[PDB]
Design a protein around this ligand. Structure first.
Ligand code: HEM
Ligand SMILES: C[C@]12CC[C@H](O)CC1=C(C#N)C[C@@H]1[C@@H]2CC[C@]2(C)C(c3cccnc3)=CC[C@@H]12
Length: 468
């Protein structure tokens, strides 16, 4: 009759074993779609069912629109400025509205968002075409294309080919994403505070390069700014600073710096990442990819290059994108939410300041809401006749919802569709000469990245004949 050992701590699973978003998901078979963990004083709630998720994001969105405070996120956002890592309050509301207003501009005009995107995609396809017959990592080329686009939206500026600044930006992007969090942003145990490490040291130095670069651009642009011409995001932010000079403290330089940084960062890493994910799946699914070549041929052909209007006709492509955004969400656990006030979820009590995580991965893989969810099946987003798109499930939130939903969704959907439409029209994208296929397991960082891989690019037999 022995006594049981006193218990000091208890965690449901091993830390740093498997992907957090899948460990939390597997836990639901034991504890249900909502449960909590406690770290000292901090408490975290994980939510794995869509009804509970739509409560947190929508029905009670404003109750749960805060952002928790993390040492790394402070450095990366210059102490909780910007949009994504700014808590709910005066600053976030202002900057999210102005960022949303800038995008609203790019409704068709002399800078119809499509035209910006298409100009930089056309450059890209000319690069890739020089690698005709070779196996390459497509990361940096697509990085350049989207970097020019968001740079145009932010400053009406693009980078000429070969600009060494692009290599500088790529370098500090990888540096921050590396040290922003070991894996997912949700970290059960606070490892950086426990043991000696250089993580915040490294993070600071990449942020110093990033802030110094954006500071050059901004100080430069004060001399280009004319109140009669408000055509990009920096114009928008300065105009606002101009008009208010309680809002002048909200639109300081450091504030404007961070918002632009948030946009410049999100616009490149998310879309570049989703493109790589899509090619990876197509290399694993030639049957899909063949069907995609047929689709484009019988609806766009080679008389001309694809267009946003072509979303009507290239449905299997729209479907494919939907299915990638489901299988491999950019933010499989969104960005951590925080309870701004005493509230409830599923009529369980949630106290002020409590961290709340939506397990978007659990929503996209719940077997009751999805037919064979771990499968790549773009067909699930099409009626059985292949003729129009459908919403097969209610647990599908690739861009979130509510007060914190994605602000660059429109941009993302158009960049994604045009990149994949131009590439399939022009190139056979096949497995390299080594038998290697990309690992579809992914790498959970602040964004769900795919390990780098190589694709063999060949100009299409058809696209060639159409040049005579
Ligand atoms: C396919 C690409 C993308 C996907 C799937 C995506 C999805 C998401 C998701 C799921 C969130 C979570 C919001 C939350 O924390 O609840 C989010 C937030 C956000 N996204 Fe995206 N996004 C994409 C691309 C972009 C782009 C191109 C931009 C360009 C500016 C952008 C800007 C943002 C910002 C600023 C936030 C934070 C908003 C806030 O905290 O209020 N994203 N996005
Ligand atoms: C971390 C990163 C990328 C590296 C860059 O050097 C610095 C950076 C940002 C800045 N400045 C904003 C972040 C973005 C990553 C994507 C983020 C987290 C993002 C997001 C993440 C997932 C989906 N949609 C948007 C909102 C803020 C963006």
């Amino acid at each position: 009759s022995l006594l049981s050992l006193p218990l000091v701590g208890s965690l449901p699973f091993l830390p740093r074993h498997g992907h957090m978003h899948n460990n939390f998901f597997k836990l639901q078979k034991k504890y249900g779609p909502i449960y909590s963990v406690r770290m000292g004083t901090k408490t975290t709630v994980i939510v794995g069912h869509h009804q509970l998720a739509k409560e947190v994001l929508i029905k009670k969105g404003k109750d749960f629109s805060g952002r928790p405070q993390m040492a790394t996120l402070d450095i990366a956002s210059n102490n909780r400025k910007g949009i994504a890592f700014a808590d709910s309050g005066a600053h976030w509301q202002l900057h999210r509205r102005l960022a949303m207003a800038t995008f609203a501009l790019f409704k068709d005009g002399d800078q119809k968002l499509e035209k910006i995107i298409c100009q930089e995609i056309s450059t890209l396809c000319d690069m890739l075409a020089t690698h005709n017959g070779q196996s390459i990592d497509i990361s940096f080329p697509v990085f350049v294309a989207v970097t020019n686009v968001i740079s145009l939206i932010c400053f009406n500026t693009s980078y000429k080919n070969g600009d060494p600044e692009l290599n500088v930006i790529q370098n500090y992007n990888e540096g921050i994403i590396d040290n922003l969090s070991k894996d997912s942003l949700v970290d059960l145990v606070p490892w950086l505070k426990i043991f000696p490490n250089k993580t915040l040291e490294k993070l600071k130095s990449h942020v110093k390069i990033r802030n110094d670069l954006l500071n050059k651009i901004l100080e430069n642009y004060k001399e280009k700014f004319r109140s009669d011409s408000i055509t990009n995001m920096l114009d928008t932010l300065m105009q606002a600073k101009m008009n208010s000079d309680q809002d002048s403290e909200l639109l300081s330089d450091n504030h404007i710096l961070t918002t632009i940084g948030d946009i410049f960062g999100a616009g490149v890493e998310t879309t570049t990442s989703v493109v790589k994910w899509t090619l990876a799946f197509l290399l694993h699914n030639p049957q899909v990819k063949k069907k995609l070549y047929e689709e484009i041929d019988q609806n766009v052909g080679f008389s001309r290059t694809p267009t946003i209007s072509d979303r009507n006709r290239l449905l299997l492509l729209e479907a494919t994108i939907r299915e990638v955004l489901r299988l491999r969400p950019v933010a499989p656990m969104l960005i951590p939410h925080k309870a701004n006030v005493d509230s409830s979820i599923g009529e369980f009590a949630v106290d002020k300041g409590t961290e709340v995580i939506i397990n978007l991965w659990a929503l996209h893989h719940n077997e009751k809401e999805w037919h064979q969810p771990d499968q790549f099946m773009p067909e699930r987003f099409l009626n059985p006749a292949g003729t129009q798109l459908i919403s097969p499930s209610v647990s599908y939130l690739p861009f979130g919802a509510g007060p914190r939903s994605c602000i660059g969704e429109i941009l993302a959907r158009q960049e994604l569709f045009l990149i994949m439409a131009w590439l399939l029209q022009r190139f056979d994208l096949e497995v390299p000469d080594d038998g290697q296929l990309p690992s579809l397991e992914g790498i959970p960082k602040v964004v769900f990245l795919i390990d780098s891989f190589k694709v063999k690019i060949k100009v299409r037999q058809a696209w060639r004949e159409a040049q005579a």
